[PDB]
Amino acid sequence: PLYVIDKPITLHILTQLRDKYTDQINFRKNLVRLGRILGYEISNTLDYEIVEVETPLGVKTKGVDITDLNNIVIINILRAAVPLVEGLLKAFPKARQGVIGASRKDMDVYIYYKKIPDIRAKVDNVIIADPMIATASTMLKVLEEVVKANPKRIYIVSIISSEYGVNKILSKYPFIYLFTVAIDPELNNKGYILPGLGDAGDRAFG
Amino acid sequence: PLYVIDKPITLHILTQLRDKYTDQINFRKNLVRLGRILGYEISNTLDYEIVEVETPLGVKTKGVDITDLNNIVIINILRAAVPLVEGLLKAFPKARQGVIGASRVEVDGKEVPKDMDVYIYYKKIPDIRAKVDNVIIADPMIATASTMLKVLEEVVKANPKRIYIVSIISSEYGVNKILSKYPFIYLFTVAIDPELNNKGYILPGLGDAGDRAFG
Amino acid sequence: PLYVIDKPITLHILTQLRDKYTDQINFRKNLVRLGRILGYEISNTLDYEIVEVETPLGVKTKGVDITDLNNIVIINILRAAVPLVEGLLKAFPKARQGVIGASRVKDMDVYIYYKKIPDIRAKVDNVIIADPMIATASTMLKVLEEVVKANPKRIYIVSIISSEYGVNKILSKYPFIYLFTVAIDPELNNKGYILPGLGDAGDRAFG
Amino acid sequence: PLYVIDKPITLHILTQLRDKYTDQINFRKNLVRLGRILGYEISNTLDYEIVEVETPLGVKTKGVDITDLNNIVIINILRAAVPLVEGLLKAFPKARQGVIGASRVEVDGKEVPKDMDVYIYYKKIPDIRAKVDNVIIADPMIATASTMLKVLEEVVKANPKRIYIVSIISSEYGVNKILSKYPFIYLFTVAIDPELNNKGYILPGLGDAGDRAFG
Numbered sequence: 029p030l031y032v033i034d035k036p037i038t039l040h041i042l043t044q045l046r047d048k049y050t051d052q053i054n055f056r057k058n059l060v061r062l063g064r065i066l067g068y069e070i071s072n073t074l075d076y077e078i079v080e081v082e083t084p085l086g087v088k089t090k091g092v093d094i095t096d097l098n099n100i101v102i103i104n105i106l107r108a109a110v111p112l113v114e115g116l117l118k119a120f121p122k123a124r125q126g127v128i129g130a131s132r133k134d135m136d137v138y139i140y141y142k143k144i145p146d147i148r149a150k151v152d153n154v155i156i157a158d159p160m161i162a163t164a165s166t167m168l169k170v171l172e173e174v175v176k177a178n179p180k181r182i183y184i185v186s187i188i189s190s191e192y193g194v195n196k197i198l199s200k201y202p203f204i205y206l207f208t209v210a211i212d213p214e215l216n217n218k219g220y221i222l223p224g225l226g227d228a229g230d231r232a233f234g
Numbered sequence: 235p236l237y238v239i240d241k242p243i244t245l246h247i248l249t250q251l252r253d254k255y256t257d258q259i260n261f262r263k264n265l266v267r268l269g270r271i272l273g274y275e276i277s278n279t280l281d282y283e284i285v286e287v288e289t290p291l292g293v294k295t296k297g298v299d300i301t302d303l304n305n306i307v308i309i310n311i312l313r314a315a316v317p318l319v320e321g322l323l324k325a326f327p328k329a330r331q332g333v334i335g336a337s338r339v340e341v342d343g344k345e346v347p348k349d350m351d352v353y354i355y356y357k358k359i360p361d362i363r364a365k366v367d368n369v370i371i372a373d374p375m376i377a378t379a380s381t382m383l384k385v386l387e388e389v390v391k392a393n394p395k396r397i398y399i400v401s402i403i404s405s406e407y408g409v410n411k412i413l414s415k416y417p418f419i420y421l422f423t424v425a426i427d428p429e430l431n432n433k434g435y436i437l438p439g440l441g442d443a444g445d446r447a448f449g
Numbered sequence: 450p451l452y453v454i455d456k457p458i459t460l461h462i463l464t465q466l467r468d469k470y471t472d473q474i475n476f477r478k479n480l481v482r483l484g485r486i487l488g489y490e491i492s493n494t495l496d497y498e499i500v501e502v503e504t505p506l507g508v509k510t511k512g513v514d515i516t517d518l519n520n521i522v523i524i525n526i527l528r529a530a531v532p533l534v535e536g537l538l539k540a541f542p543k544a545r546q547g548v549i550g551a552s553r554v555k556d557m558d559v560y561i562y563y564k565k566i567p568d569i570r571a572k573v574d575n576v577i578i579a580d581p582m583i584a585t586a587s588t589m590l591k592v593l594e595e596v597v598k599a600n601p602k603r604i605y606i607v608s609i610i611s612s613e614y615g616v617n618k619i620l621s622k623y624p625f626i627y628l629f630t631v632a633i634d635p636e637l638n639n640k641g642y643i644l645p646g647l648g649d650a651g652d653r654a655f656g
Numbered sequence: 657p658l659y660v661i662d663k664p665i666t667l668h669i670l671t672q673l674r675d676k677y678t679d680q681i682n683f684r685k686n687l688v689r690l691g692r693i694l695g696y697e698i699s700n701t702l703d704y705e706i707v708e709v710e711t712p713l714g715v716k717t718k719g720v721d722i723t724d725l726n727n728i729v730i731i732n733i734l735r736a737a738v739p740l741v742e743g744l745l746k747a748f749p750k751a752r753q754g755v756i757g758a759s760r761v762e763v764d765g766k767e768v769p770k771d772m773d774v775y776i777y778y779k780k781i782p783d784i785r786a787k788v789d790n791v792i793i794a795d796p797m798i799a800t801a802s803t804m805l806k807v808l809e810e811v812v813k814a815n816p817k818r819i820y821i822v823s824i825i826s827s828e829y830g831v832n833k834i835l836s837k838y839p840f841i842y843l844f845t846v847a848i849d850p851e852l853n854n855k856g857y858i859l860p861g862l863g864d865a866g867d868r869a870f871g
């Protein structure tokens with residue numbers, strides 16, 4: 029399923045990200061802000077069980093507990109992802125982290141580095157983060173690795189994704205929960221997202 | 235209008251708050267967490283205009299600018315509200331802050347107090363701009379609304395563009411008691427507990443947020 | 450004893466606070482920043498016992514545990530103090546907070562408007578009284594007059610700037626107190642403001 | 657020069673880090689806490705300039721401005737450092753983040769490792785303005801300093817104004833192996849553990865910071 033989070037709050041931040049006038053401090057900071065907000069969206073979709081707690085005045089009342097918050101494995105795709113993940117962790121403190129290294133349309137992408145914790149089959153909720161999904165190659169390559177682990181669920185957290193990508197990804201993995209703030213219409217020749225926001229990695233790491 | 239924010243995330247934190255076993259650190263911390271989350275919600279209700287920015291790649295594109303984020307006066311109802319306001323400020327760093335030291339009078343009686351001797355022992359509110367500012371009144375719990383209504387009497391006078399109320403728990407009695415006397419108010423809350431008890435406390439409730447968070 | 454924290458880092462932030470060009474966001478934010486920084490300074494002065502812990506290679510070694518971090522009772526001198534206490538809480542999360550509103554009415558003394566201080570454990574709690582500006586030290590002394598009655602294990606005072614008049618009037622009446630501050634300004638006018646200071650902290654912070 | 661930051665506050669956090677029973681969250685969180693604390697310590701050694709600002713009181717006063725907070729490049733030695741750098745950034749927001757991915761060529765019981773082979777699987781480092789930038793290399797642990805020296809190998813031909821090393825724990829062997837070759841480096845650390853074992857692990861140490869933090 030596709031989850032486009034276009035509420036005023038996120039669209040407001042996205043705007044500042046897109047604005048070529050926002051410096052690296054504010055750019056990185058907004059990536060963090062969206063990561064936490066984005067993690068709160070993902071939070072509401074997770075499996076939870078009904079519990080009972082007694083209150084100070086000695087009365088019992090039903091409550092909620094998002095159990096799966098203990099079963100999260102965030103996958104950091106090297107670079108631009110670091111800041112976004114820094115937001116996600118605000119919503120998934122108990123999550124373990126994996127990092128991946130890969131690099132280059134349609135051209136195949138190769139994985140050159142990868143240290144991922146052990147994904148508990150049928151239990152874990154893997155969250156693969158990367159601010160931008162253009163052609164969707166990077167993402168799909170990481171996916172191969174992830175599906176092998178047979179996780180309970182797989183989420184993809186991005187800021188902007190091209191239509192080409194969303195469809196590319198959801199067409200081969202309809203069971204994947206793809207979250208994003210905006211879906212931009214095109215990819216020029218260089219494989220860039222338009223309007224997009226330029227190069228996230230560069231705008232944040234500086 | 236009434237805004238009950240009962241998404242799994244907030245209901246999850248509320249549970250923690252209600253849990254008598256939840257210690258002081260965690261109690262105070264969840265009040266902050268909800269304040270932040272509630273500010274974000276309140277943020278999506280604010281007036282915004284569409285602007286048009288230019289991306290590094292040279293093109294223009296429509297965006298969003300919540301202009302009213304520059305126009306926010308938060309009212310921190312002294313004590314319990316401090317952790318909650320800390321939360322809100324994460325969503326409204328351009329907000330001015332008024333502090334009101336209200337204090338309720340205890341009354342052990344037969345029924346449930348309708349209104350109580352609520353006198354304000356403190357009140358330093360910054361200048362509110364008529365027909366422009368969005369005043370946000372914060373207080374973790376609204377029981378009989380005594381306190382709340384008492385403050386609204388002060389804020390109203392300054393005719394703000396609109397008034398919000400941010401609470402974690404609110405009794406049915408109160409919600410109605412406020413939306414009746416001030417119908418065009420934006421009341422946000424995570425849960426609406428059925429009834430108030432013999433001593434004006436909310437049931438089930440989460441205990442005395444004031445004591446729980448400051449000790 | 451007097452603890453003047455004038456390291457480059459704090460003097461750097463103070464400068465921004467003093468600067469008339471620093472807005473409500475940045476002013477309030479630096480009060481928070483200094484609050485946690487001074488909190489760490491107070492931390493280094495607290496009681497702590499030596500403990501033993503086993504490291505991941507099954508090797509036991511000595512370490513440190515500032516348990517007194519469990520016995521903190523911070524007091525808000527209403528308004529300007531809130532942002533300051535916010536940062537201190539970053540260093541004393543387990544602290545119980547106290548709120549207290551006062552006001553004036555040459556060195557005109559004071560009257561207590563509001564006062565809610567949690568129960569202080571005699572010879573156990575480390576009470577920390579927060580208030581960014583200590584001018585004629587009256588507000589401060591009036592609050593002390595109550596805290597001292599509770600015989601806490603210790604008493605700290607956390608401020609950003611304080612006048613020499615104040616530092617001396619406070620440390621002369623209660624010598625055992627730990628007064629922390631970033632700067633000690635020279636004078637104060639006929640009105641009672643600290644010069645050059647930074648203006649009305651409460652107004653610069655709250656707007 | 658060597659800067660051992662062993663004040664009660666940092667020794668208190670280190671203890672928690674060493675405590676094998678310190679769960680992942682708390683472990684990661686303390687790495688952040690120390691990163692920020694250690695940064696404020698570094699800020700205190702940076703070149704500063706006296707300035708003059710204006711109080712609203714119309715009056716004027718001399719002040720401090722560590723102008724060098726604009727000339728900082730942090731190199732996040734990959735994995736272990738993420739939490740550590742995450743806090744240094746709390747002290748150096750105007751810093752550019754360089755990122756090197758180092759991986760040690762393990763070895764098993766033999767004798768005690770004197771220097772190990774390092775495999776570079778990633779490198780994105782901004783341009784270091786010669787005679788201008790203060791480069792800060794971060795890595796929780798320094799065992800044989802193999803990794804460290806490997807990185808210094810590049811950060812040095814760039815002649816930065818100054819080079820800092822931020823670590824939580826470093827072995828005697830390492831501190832000496834680094835400062836003997838790069839006498840003028842500013843090496844910051846909370847503790848200097850005595851010996852290393854046959855696998856090159858610090859003792860007593862605190863385990864594998866990367867494994868503890870990334871789980």
Ligand SMILES: Nc1nc2c(ncn2[C@@H]2O[C@H](COP(=O)(O)OP(=O)(O)OP(=O)(O)O)[C@@H](O)[C@H]2O)c(=O)[nH]1
Pocket residue numbers: 117118119121263266267681682685
């Ligand atoms: N047990 C424990 N958990 C912690 C601690 N600090 C942070 N956490 C958890 O990590 C999450 C994110 O922590 P931070 O990076 O400090 O983020 P934050 O901006 O303070 O977010 P909030 O804590 O929600 O206000 C929190 O929501 C907590 O659930 C700590 O000292 N102990």
Ligand SMILES: Nc1nc2c(ncn2[C@@H]2O[C@H](COP(=O)(O)OP(=O)(O)OP(=O)(O)O)[C@@H](O)[C@H]2O)c(=O)[nH]1
Pocket residue numbers: 057060061323324325327474475478
């Ligand atoms: N201009 C400016 N604004 C700041 C600064 N620090 C914080 N703010 C603003 O104040 C809000 C809340 O700041 P913090 O208390 O640091 O909150 P936070 O936990 O860091 O959360 P974030 O919103 O993710 O940064 C931010 O969303 C900013 O809009 C600062 O140094 N400069």
Ligand SMILES: Nc1nc2c(ncn2[C@@H]2O[C@H](COP(=O)(O)OP(=O)(O)OP(=O)(O)O)[C@@H](O)[C@H]2O)c(=O)[nH]1
Pocket residue numbers: 259260263538539540542685688689
């Ligand atoms: N048990 C527990 N302790 C917490 C939690 N969040 C914060 N704390 C404690 O409170 C302190 C400060 O918390 P915050 O208000 O989030 O401050 P912060 O800006 O995140 O600062 P640091 O956590 O030190 O990085 C931490 O150092 C913790 O000791 C939490 O979720 N659980």
Ligand SMILES: Nc1nc2c(ncn2[C@@H]2O[C@H](COP(=O)(O)OP(=O)(O)OP(=O)(O)O)[C@@H](O)[C@H]2O)c(=O)[nH]1
Pocket residue numbers: 053054057481482745746747749
């Ligand atoms: N311009 C701008 N600067 C910011 C903002 N938020 C943070 N900063 C800067 O980034 C630094 C660290 O910010 P954060 O990562 O949020 O750190 P923090 O946990 O909030 O800690 P504090 O800065 O003490 O509040 C600060 O020293 C600020 O100079 C923001 O919204 N705008």
Ligand SMILES: O=P(O)(O)OC[C@H]1O[C@H](OP(=O)(O)OP(=O)(O)O)[C@H](O)[C@@H]1O
Pocket residue numbers: 311312313314336337338352373375376377378379380381382408434442443444445
């Ligand atoms: O809707 P109402 O019936 O007026 O009650 C709500 C208020 O009462 C409690 O404060 P209290 O006066 O007990 O002060 P404290 O929280 O600072 O102890 C509570 O924290 C609210 O502030």
Ligand SMILES: O=P(O)(O)OC[C@H]1O[C@H](OP(=O)(O)OP(=O)(O)O)[C@H](O)[C@@H]1O
Pocket residue numbers: 733734735736737758759760772795796797798799800801802803804830856865866867
């Ligand atoms: O001082 P040295 O003897 O060179 O060894 C110490 C290094 O080992 C760890 O990284 P590691 O290569 O194990 O990678 P990881 O921490 O990312 O898992 C640590 O982060 C240091 O970089």
Ligand SMILES: O=P(O)(O)OC[C@H]1O[C@H](O)[C@H](O)[C@@H]1O
Pocket residue numbers: 105108137158159160161162163164165166167193219228229
């Ligand atoms: O493979 P694509 O989806 O086309 O592009 C993905 C990468 O390109 C950008 O650097 C993103 O941040 C990812 O790292």
Ligand SMILES: O=P(O)(O)OC[C@H]1O[C@H](O)[C@H](O)[C@@H]1O
Pocket residue numbers: 526529530580581582583584585586587588589615641650651
């Ligand atoms: O009593 P003084 O030390 O002269 O002045 C103290 C108060 O004046 C300022 O508002 C400070 O913030 C304190 O609240």
Ligand SMILES: O=P(O)(O)OC[C@H]1O[C@H](O)[C@H](O)[C@@H]1O
Pocket residue numbers: 506760762856857858861862863864865866867
């Ligand atoms: O696998 P690595 O991270 O390279 O080495 C792991 C060990 O190194 C650390 O000192 C701890 O003792 C760990 O056991």
Ligand SMILES: [Mg+2]
Pocket residue numbers: none
């Ligand atoms: Mg926190």
Ligand SMILES: [Mg+2]
Pocket residue numbers: 312313314315444
């Ligand atoms: Mg109250």
Ligand SMILES: [Mg+2]
Pocket residue numbers: 733734735736737758866
């Ligand atoms: Mg490592």
Ligand SMILES: [Mg+2]
Pocket residue numbers: none
């Ligand atoms: Mg911040």
